[PDB]
Design an enzyme around this catalytic site. Sequence first.
Site, PDB file in Angstrom:
ATOM      1  N   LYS A   1      30.955  36.141  40.585  1.00 56.28           N
ATOM      2  CA  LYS A   1      31.867  35.951  39.474  1.00 56.28           C
ATOM      3  C   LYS A   1      32.671  34.680  39.687  1.00 56.28           C
ATOM      4  O   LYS A   1      33.197  34.434  40.778  1.00 56.28           O
ATOM      5  CB  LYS A   1      32.801  37.148  39.331  1.00 56.28           C
ATOM      6  CG  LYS A   1      32.096  38.444  38.990  1.00 56.28           C
ATOM      7  CD  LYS A   1      33.108  39.573  38.877  1.00 56.28           C
ATOM      8  CE  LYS A   1      32.491  40.824  38.284  1.00 56.28           C
ATOM      9  NZ  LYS A   1      33.528  41.886  38.038  1.00 56.28           N
TER      10      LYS A   1
ATOM     11  N   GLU B   1      42.698  43.586  51.737  1.00 56.61           N
ATOM     12  CA  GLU B   1      41.363  43.808  51.209  1.00 56.61           C
ATOM     13  C   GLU B   1      40.431  44.308  52.300  1.00 56.61           C
ATOM     14  O   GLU B   1      39.553  45.135  52.023  1.00 56.61           O
ATOM     15  CB  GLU B   1      40.846  42.524  50.558  1.00 56.61           C
ATOM     16  CG  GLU B   1      41.685  42.076  49.351  1.00 56.61           C
ATOM     17  CD  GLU B   1      41.471  42.961  48.123  1.00 56.61           C
ATOM     18  OE1 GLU B   1      40.391  43.570  48.015  1.00 56.61           O
ATOM     19  OE2 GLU B   1      42.382  43.053  47.276  1.00 56.61           O
TER      20      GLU B   1
ATOM     21  N   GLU C   1      29.151  52.991  43.090  1.00 53.28           N
ATOM     22  CA  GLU C   1      29.378  52.005  42.041  1.00 53.28           C
ATOM     23  C   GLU C   1      30.330  50.906  42.499  1.00 53.28           C
ATOM     24  O   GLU C   1      31.095  51.074  43.457  1.00 53.28           O
ATOM     25  CB  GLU C   1      29.931  52.672  40.778  1.00 53.28           C
TER      26      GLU C   1
ATOM     27  N   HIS D   1      43.921  49.231  42.843  1.00 53.14           N
ATOM     28  CA  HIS D   1      44.149  48.122  41.921  1.00 53.14           C
ATOM     29  C   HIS D   1      44.824  48.551  40.618  1.00 53.14           C
ATOM     30  O   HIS D   1      45.527  47.743  40.002  1.00 53.14           O
ATOM     31  CB  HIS D   1      42.828  47.400  41.640  1.00 53.14           C
ATOM     32  CG  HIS D   1      42.413  46.457  42.733  1.00 53.14           C
ATOM     33  ND1 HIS D   1      42.171  46.873  44.026  1.00 53.14           N
ATOM     34  CD2 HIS D   1      42.207  45.118  42.725  1.00 53.14           C
ATOM     35  CE1 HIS D   1      41.828  45.833  44.766  1.00 53.14           C
ATOM     36  NE2 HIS D   1      41.844  44.755  44.002  1.00 53.14           N
TER      37      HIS D   1
HETATM   38  N1  LIG Z   1      35.413  35.515  42.031  1.00 50.53           N
HETATM   39  C1  LIG Z   1      35.799  36.676  42.591  1.00 50.53           C
HETATM   40  O1  LIG Z   1      35.063  37.651  42.665  1.00 50.53           O
HETATM   41  C2  LIG Z   1      37.183  36.742  43.142  1.00 50.53           C
HETATM   42  C3  LIG Z   1      37.585  37.626  44.163  1.00 50.53           C
HETATM   43  C4  LIG Z   1      38.873  37.621  44.622  1.00 50.53           C
HETATM   44  C5  LIG Z   1      39.784  36.729  44.056  1.00 50.53           C
HETATM   45  N2  LIG Z   1      39.384  35.888  43.089  1.00 50.53           N
HETATM   46  C6  LIG Z   1      40.439  34.969  42.536  1.00 50.53           C
HETATM   47  O2  LIG Z   1      41.019  34.380  43.668  1.00 50.53           O
HETATM   48  C7  LIG Z   1      42.418  33.984  43.392  1.00 50.53           C
HETATM   49  C8  LIG Z   1      43.339  34.346  44.562  1.00 50.53           C
HETATM   50  O3  LIG Z   1      42.737  33.745  45.703  1.00 50.53           O
HETATM   51  P1  LIG Z   1      43.645  33.539  47.083  1.00 50.53           P
HETATM   52  O4  LIG Z   1      44.332  34.908  47.344  1.00 50.53           O
HETATM   53  O5  LIG Z   1      42.746  32.856  48.126  1.00 50.53           O
HETATM   54  O6  LIG Z   1      44.750  32.516  46.521  1.00 50.53           O
HETATM   55  P2  LIG Z   1      44.891  30.906  46.467  1.00 50.53           P
HETATM   56  O7  LIG Z   1      43.459  30.365  46.279  1.00 50.53           O
HETATM   57  O8  LIG Z   1      46.008  30.526  45.459  1.00 50.53           O
HETATM   58  O9  LIG Z   1      45.412  30.661  48.010  1.00 50.53           O
HETATM   59  C9  LIG Z   1      46.652  31.147  48.517  1.00 50.53           C
HETATM   60  C10 LIG Z   1      47.503  29.952  48.911  1.00 50.53           C
HETATM   61  O10 LIG Z   1      47.107  29.448  50.225  1.00 50.53           O
HETATM   62  C11 LIG Z   1      46.914  28.034  50.215  1.00 50.53           C
HETATM   63  N3  LIG Z   1      45.871  27.906  51.198  1.00 50.53           N
HETATM   64  C12 LIG Z   1      44.523  28.223  51.091  1.00 50.53           C
HETATM   65  N4  LIG Z   1      43.888  28.058  52.212  1.00 50.53           N
HETATM   66  C13 LIG Z   1      44.867  27.618  53.109  1.00 50.53           C
HETATM   67  C14 LIG Z   1      44.836  27.283  54.453  1.00 50.53           C
HETATM   68  N5  LIG Z   1      43.713  27.345  55.146  1.00 50.53           N
HETATM   69  N6  LIG Z   1      45.968  26.879  55.047  1.00 50.53           N
HETATM   70  C15 LIG Z   1      47.101  26.835  54.348  1.00 50.53           C
HETATM   71  N7  LIG Z   1      47.247  27.144  53.062  1.00 50.53           N
HETATM   72  C16 LIG Z   1      46.094  27.532  52.485  1.00 50.53           C
HETATM   73  C17 LIG Z   1      46.519  27.712  48.779  1.00 50.53           C
HETATM   74  O11 LIG Z   1      46.871  26.359  48.473  1.00 50.53           O
HETATM   75  C18 LIG Z   1      47.405  28.716  48.014  1.00 50.53           C
HETATM   76  O12 LIG Z   1      48.741  28.200  47.982  1.00 50.53           O
HETATM   77  C19 LIG Z   1      42.784  34.708  42.099  1.00 50.53           C
HETATM   78  O13 LIG Z   1      42.742  33.771  40.996  1.00 50.53           O
HETATM   79  C20 LIG Z   1      41.632  35.727  41.885  1.00 50.53           C
HETATM   80  O14 LIG Z   1      41.438  36.029  40.503  1.00 50.53           O
HETATM   81  C21 LIG Z   1      38.110  35.883  42.619  1.00 50.53           C
HETATM   82 MG   LIG Z   2      41.787  42.474  44.754  1.00 51.09          MG
END
Ligand SMILES: NC(=O)c1ccc[n+]([C@@H]2O[C@H](COP(=O)([O-])OP(=O)(O)OC[C@H]3O[C@@H](n4cnc5c(N)ncnc54)[C@H](O)[C@@H]3O)[C@@H](O)[C@H]2O)c1
Ligand SMILES: [Mg+2]
Length: 355
Positions: A142, A184, A236, A244
């Site tokens: 996704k 998670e 599923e 959630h």
């Molecule tokens: N496609 C999917 O199936 C799927 C699954 C889970 C989440 N998502 C999406 O992911 C997003 C959330 O992702 P997240 O929780 O990684 O948030 P994010 O991508 O905003 O990262 C969290 C924060 O950490 C910083 N950061 C990232 N890596 C870092 C590092 N190594 N060192 C320091 N800072 C770092 C980023 O700049 C950000 O400020 C949401 O938009 C969600 O909808 C998608």
């Molecule tokens: Mg989640």
Amino acid sequence: HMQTLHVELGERRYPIFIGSQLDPKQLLEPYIHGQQVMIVSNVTVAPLYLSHYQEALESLGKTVATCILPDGEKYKDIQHLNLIFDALLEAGFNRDCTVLALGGGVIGDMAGFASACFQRGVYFVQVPTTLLSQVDSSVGGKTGINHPLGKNMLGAFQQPQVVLADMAQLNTLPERELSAGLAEVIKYALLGDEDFLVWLEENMDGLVARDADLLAEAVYRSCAHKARIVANDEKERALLNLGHTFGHAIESYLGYGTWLHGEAVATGMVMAADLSQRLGWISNEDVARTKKIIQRANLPISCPQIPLDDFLGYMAHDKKVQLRLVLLKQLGQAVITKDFDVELMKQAILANQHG
Ligand SMILES: NC(=O)c1ccc[n+]([C@@H]2O[C@H](COP(=O)([O-])OP(=O)(O)OC[C@H]3O[C@@H](n4cnc5c(N)ncnc54)[C@H](O)[C@@H]3O)[C@@H](O)[C@H]2O)c1
Ligand SMILES: [Mg+2]
């Protein structure tokens, strides 16, 4: 020692390489099928890790361009998606270029969606740099962005050629973000693997401490669980929603940026377990056990006061189409069910709000 998980989703197959201080020139060569690579990152991750990947791919002989986005979920929209298209066309990239997502899940989704749209689909590589993106965004295909009227309502199914998960990048992650990822990890154990729960209880001190080897095992086991769930679902997937529905109401009431998503999922899992105890399915000891491991991951087990009218409204506004919850028949055995007393659900919500 590096570990490889082989994922099979759709008619596509790709490896997830999991380890520490990986060599991207060695690992990515079989998976960059053209001359050009577009690295998408943000202003926070790029100064830390961009040159590492750019120098490796340039030493490989590739032409590397970059697109550095602002940092934030609020920029995960079509206006900022367009900046990636700008960079891709400014660089003159062709149908066989590769888009490389360097960052957390926001970057992963944006770069993934951009890669699906550019020339009607180019190659995609994932380099997730948050724990949450390593164990959640790396399987499932996704991709998406937000709209003012709905989150993750625009996107594409897009599988990567390869995912590179380097634990060393977690060393610069903020503590709350690391814990948000462990929420998670805990979730996978609680929904379907009590042995994994036992291992988390034995090893949580070192995971919070960012032990490279333990992190790598937790990531491998988490990705293996999700890959198995989605592959079996195709044969599923809703069990991935443990915590959630409760968590979404927490996030929606507290508002953007108050709690991390994983923090809301943590407390939501406690509410789910609590309700499960009130239904007579699990014991108070099981709830206590669930609270303890989440607390040891430095996650909250209770959220601020939220009026039940608003809380229930948020759970009913997220309805799939009858309200179904992911609850626990046993620790490590989640179920999706409509068979709960709403009064007992309200009790579980109120019990896990702090003064
Ligand atoms: N496609 C999917 O199936 C799927 C699954 C889970 C989440 N998502 C999406 O992911 C997003 C959330 O992702 P997240 O929780 O990684 O948030 P994010 O991508 O905003 O990262 C969290 C924060 O950490 C910083 N950061 C990232 N890596 C870092 C590092 N190594 N060192 C320091 N800072 C770092 C980023 O700049 C950000 O400020 C949401 O938009 C969600 O909808 C998608
Ligand atoms: Mg989640």
